[PDB]
């Protein structure tokens, strides 16, 4: 029934994990970067970071470690995906051909087991004897590394401590040993166990039970000769080795939270550290040498180095160069210098790497009126927030222009008449001892050409001013007007205290010819489970002046809003309301629909309203002009957690689930009973691997004129938390069957890295159901058909009948398929 086509326009840019080692050869130094489903291999060399090979896997890389067992010239790579497709990879280069060989492969999922809150953790014994894995609570999977044996018998081991945060393999121990930190009713503790392979249990370790800082969230295993481990908390750093114990609580650390670390010296003397604010630290392990040759640790020292993009993973490469991998911001390549600059910072940035994600919202607009849309995104977060003007073509394909904001953007829309962008944002200010709040850094809002503050008393002092404890972060939201040419902050309106702006619209209402900016907010309080108050403010921007045309008090939070045929459609908590723009310039209620749990996402086409719920999936509504109320036409009974919705056609409705899955609901045209017509049937299923955040009709390619018979109909872009930008189209049944048949043939020709089945990769998967993909075509797989060798192409076309457009299928030929794919590959 439904036949859709999914392709990727911008591969993900966020960095999940980074590891360095000897992979290509024993003499080269390699840097490996994991970007969700993409593995990048770089060679640390004089000229920079030479790319070698970029490999995309059929999974979300969740673990990546390098190890070299005995008898191996160069290291081996072990990767575990979020679907538990464990594998062990080897790098082989034959002449100019570069290949990745899967030495071992297999799935290690347990059908019974509670996934751990802290996520997947992978560890390898320093001697390359076993591989630990902390997937499910209460179990510690192991994988012995018998070179000779052909069946690597992975076995789980009972683990008494259920809430384990971090676990590591210690150094300099005769038998494999693990140190980990776990939580329990008494607090947080650090414990050690010895792994006995044959008996298959844990043996008492050489340490003792201890009680540590409740925020302890990371463990570093110091190599020889120190041994022991380092425990990093929110306000302390400690060293444990037998009975040796050290503690430091520098005041500098508490200002942020450490979330990454890396070893510089093989002896473990110098350690890097990064925190949320972007500050980069250095941990020093000072050693005192005894007269009997025993190395004893003297003391710790933490010294600030500078500032960098908010770091997710650090990796010291060589000669004082550090690679900073960031999700929220661009990934940097900094230089550590012997002498600080005038500002006392030893960090010098050498290069920066583009990172669109996390895309939080976007709008497709045509600045040049030439038919070429220029996607504008609300990228980044915190000090990395910015606007990326993604323009296709040259004038490689994607040209990105960055407009830093130094604060998190949330929403965006374009007002053509005013030639400006309306953008929401939220900087962070700390409650100063003076009773007010002070911005931590200058941002776009504080550097506005003109400024204004909302002056309204709709919310009296009935709510008591709670304990404004000094030092507690507070979010302050503003509406920024941004020019479409120079991208300056023409105006910056600020909202009330504890008021969050959630939705933004720019539309004409009713007979009024004036355009407006409409904002839906919500008075948020930390101790309140849900917002019980909100507002809808109508702003007008004229001649560089912003006017608060009218306000409106609502009993909830305005999660979403949309213009509905000259009327304002707004969702308030569990309600969907329709407003009218009276001649007195006020909003008047027209009709309601209270049958939702939480109406988060709204979309409209004609008189139909598509409502996305927090947990109850999609719901279709209609407006009755003669009766002036809502008729609940149909709904979906599959309880999906939604994160975005869109209306592809009048009959097909697209949604995105929380577990990185897409699905397509359809209206039951075969239903006879009125009850059967009230069910929405699911015709599409697909595992995308990305958390889609927004849909927006549009296309970056010039709109072809007169080509209404193109293989594809429609165009929907969507942005993900990882920076991926994908395009969705509908297909005729004849083409869907042709490509579906081609899709299966390809899987028999192309060997997937890790020997992971494509059908398993794209299989719909949630906590409730797991089904194979239906009604979707993986565009990425089809495009790969071009890059394979010609004789490989001939294999697919064998014994396959193809329709040359005359209505009958003749013997297919590769060149014929080339033309089909070439049209498909040019639609993005």
């Amino acid at each position: 029934m439904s036949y859709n086509y999914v392709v990727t326009a911008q591969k993900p840019t966020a960095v999940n994990g980074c590891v360095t080692g000897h992979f290509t050869s024993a003499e080269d130094l390699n840097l490996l970067i994991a970007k969700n489903t993409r593995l990048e291999i770089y060679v640390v060399t004089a000229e920079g970071l030479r790319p070698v090979k970029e490999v995309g896997m059929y999974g979300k890389i969740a673990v990546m470690e390098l190890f070299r067992p005995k008898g191996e010239s160069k290291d081996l790579l072990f990767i575990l995906t979020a679907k538990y497709n464990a594998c062990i990879l080897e790098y082989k280069q034959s002449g100019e051909s570069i290949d990745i060989i899967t030495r071992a492969h297999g799935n290690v999922q347990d059908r019974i087991g509670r996934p751990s809150e802290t996520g997947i953790i992978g560890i390898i014994d320093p001697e390359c004897r076993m591989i630990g894995l902390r997937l499910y609570d209460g179990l510690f999977k192991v994988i012995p590394l018998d070179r000779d044996n052909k069946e690597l018998k992975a076995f789980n081991i009972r683990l008494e401590e259920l809430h384990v945060i971090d676990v590591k393999f210690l150094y300099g121990c005769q038998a494999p040993t693990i140190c980990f930190v776990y939580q329990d009713p008494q607090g947080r503790h650090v414990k050690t166990y010895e792994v006995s392979l044959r008996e298959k249990e844990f043996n008492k370790g050489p340490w003792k039970q201890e009680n540590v800082e409740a925020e302890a969230s990371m463990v570093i295993a110091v190599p020889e000769p120190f041994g022991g481990a380092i425990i990093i908390g929110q306000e302390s750093i400690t060293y444990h080795n037998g009975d040796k114990y050290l503690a430091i609580a520098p005041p500098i650390i508490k200002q942020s939270t450490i979330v990454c670390h890396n070893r510089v010296d093989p002896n473990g003397s110098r350690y890097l550290l990064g925190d949320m604010e972007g500050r980069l630290f250095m941990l020093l392990l000072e050693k005192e040498e005894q007269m009997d040759g025993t190395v004893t640790l003297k003391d710790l020292r933490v010294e600030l180095l500078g500032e960098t993009s908010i770091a997710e993973c650090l990796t010291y490469l060589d000669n004082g160069v550090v690679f900073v991998g960031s999700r929220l911001g661009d990934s940097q390549l900094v230089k550590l210098n012997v002498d600080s600059n005038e500002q006392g910072s030893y960090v010098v940035a050498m290069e920066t790497f583009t990172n669109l994600g996390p895309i939080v919202d976007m709008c497709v607009v045509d600045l040049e009126r030439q038919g070429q849309g220029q996607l504008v995104t609300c990228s980044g977060a915190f000090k990395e927030g910015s606007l990326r003007i993604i323009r296709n073509g040259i004038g490689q394909k994607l040209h990105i222009r960055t407009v830093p904001l130094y604060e998190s953007p949330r929403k965006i829309c374009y007002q053509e008449v005013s030639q400006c962008f309306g953008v929401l944002s939220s900087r962070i200010e700390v409650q100063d001892t003076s009773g007010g709040t002070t911005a931590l850094r200058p941002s776009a809002s504080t550097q506005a050409l003109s400024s204004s503050v909302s002056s309204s008393k709709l919310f009296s002092s009935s709510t008591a001013p709670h304990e404004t404890s000094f030092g507690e972060e507070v979010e302050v939201h503003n509406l920024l007007i941004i020019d479409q040419h120079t991208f300056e902050v023409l105006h910056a309106h600020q909202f009330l205290q504890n008021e969050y702006a959630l939705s933004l619209v720019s539309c004409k209402l009713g007979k009024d010819p004036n355009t407006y900016f409409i904002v839906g907010t919500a008075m948020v309080y930390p101790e309140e489970a849900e917002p019980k108050q909100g507002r809808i403010v109508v702003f007008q921007y004229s001649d560089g002046k912003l006017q608060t045309v009218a306000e409106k008090e609502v009993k909830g939070a305005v999660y979403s809003m949309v213009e509905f045929n000259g009327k304002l459609l707004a969702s308030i908590n569990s309600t969907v309301r329709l407003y009218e723009w009276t001649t007195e310039k006020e909003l008047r209620t027209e009709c309601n629909h209270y049958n939702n749990i939480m109406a988060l996402y709204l979309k409209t086409k004609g008189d139909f309203i598509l409502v996305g719920d927090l947990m109850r999936s999609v719901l279709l509504l209609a407006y009755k002009p003669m009766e002036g109320n809502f008729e609940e036409i149909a709904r979906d009974f599959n309880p999906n957690w939604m994160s975005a919705v869109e209306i592809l056609d009048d009959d097909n409705f697209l949604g995105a689930e929380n577990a990185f899955n897409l699905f397509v609901c359809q209206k039951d045209s075969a239903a006879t009973t009125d009850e059967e017509r009230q069910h929405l049937q699911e015709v599409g299923l697909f595992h995308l691997g990305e958390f889609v955040n927004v849909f927006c009709h549009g296309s970056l390619v010039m709109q072809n004129l007169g080509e209404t018979s193109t293989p594809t109909q429609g165009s929907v872009l969507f942005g993900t938390v990882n920076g991926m930008i994908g395009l969705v189209t509908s297909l005729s049944e004849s083409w869907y069957n042709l490509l579906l048949d081609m899709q299966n043939r390809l899987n028999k020709v192309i060997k997937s890295v890790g020997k992971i089945e494509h059908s398993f990769w794209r299989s719909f998967h949630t906590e409730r159901k797991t089904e194979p993909a239906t009604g979707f075509i993986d565009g990425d797989l089809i495009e790969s058909f071009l890059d394979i060798s010609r004789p490989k192409m001939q294999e697919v076309v064998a014994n396959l009948q193809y329709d040359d457009g005359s209505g009958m299928k003749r013997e297919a030929t590769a060149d014929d398929l080339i033309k089909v794919v070439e049209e498909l590959t040019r639609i993005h």
Partner: protein, 43 residues
């Protein structure tokens, strides 16, 4: 004083699945019972 002499790998720094991983089919509780049973035969 503490940033000096950083590691240098090179002065020119910047200017056929042979094995299969199979999880044990038997559930863990059963494995404990089975393994304890085999001790009786030895004893």
């Amino acid at each position: 004083d503490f940033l000096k002499g950083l590691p240098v790998y090179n002065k020119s720094n910047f200017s056929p699945s042979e094995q299969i991983i199979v999880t044990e089919k038997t559930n863990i509780l059963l494995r404990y019972l089975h393994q304890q049973w085999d001790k009786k035969n030895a004893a």
